[PDB]
Design a protein around this ligand. Sequence first.
Ligand SMILES: *[C@H]1O[C@H](CO)[C@H](O)[C@H](O)[C@H]1O
Ligand SMILES: *[C@H]1O[C@H](CO)[C@H](O)[C@H](O)[C@H]1O
Ligand SMILES: *[C@H]1O[C@H](CO)[C@H](O)[C@H](O)[C@H]1O
Ligand SMILES: *[C@H]1O[C@H](CO)[C@H](O)[C@H](O)[C@H]1O
Ligand SMILES: *[C@H]1O[C@H](CO)[C@H](O)[C@H](O)[C@H]1O
Length: 48
Amino acid sequence: PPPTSPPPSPPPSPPPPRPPPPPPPPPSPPPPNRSPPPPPPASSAINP
Ligand SMILES: *[C@H]1O[C@H](CO)[C@H](O)[C@H](O)[C@H]1O
Ligand SMILES: *[C@H]1O[C@H](CO)[C@H](O)[C@H](O)[C@H]1O
Ligand SMILES: *[C@H]1O[C@H](CO)[C@H](O)[C@H](O)[C@H]1O
Ligand SMILES: *[C@H]1O[C@H](CO)[C@H](O)[C@H](O)[C@H]1O
Ligand SMILES: *[C@H]1O[C@H](CO)[C@H](O)[C@H](O)[C@H]1O
């Protein structure tokens, strides 16, 4: 007899485990230091 046909081929292997997740970004930098107010106008003279 002719050589018997080979057994069926196995189904495709499963995909490797999917990668882990990224890490949360470092704390966002604080706001800019707001500048101070301006000095009051030159005051008048004290009462006599
Ligand atoms: C698979 O091939 C063989 C020959 O190698 C044979 O013809 C079988 O009948 C067939 O199923
Ligand atoms: C798929 O694999 C089988 C053996 O498992 C055989 O070689 C077939 O010829 C091939 O198509
Ligand atoms: C991955 O699995 C299939 C069967 O699901 C087969 O065995 C391969 O040889 C293997 O790499
Ligand atoms: C402030 O910066 C961090 C990273 O430095 C992150 O992107 C925040 O989303 C942002 O608000
Ligand atoms: C006033 O000072 C702050 C820093 O405290 C900053 O440089 C502002 O740009 C400036 O106007």
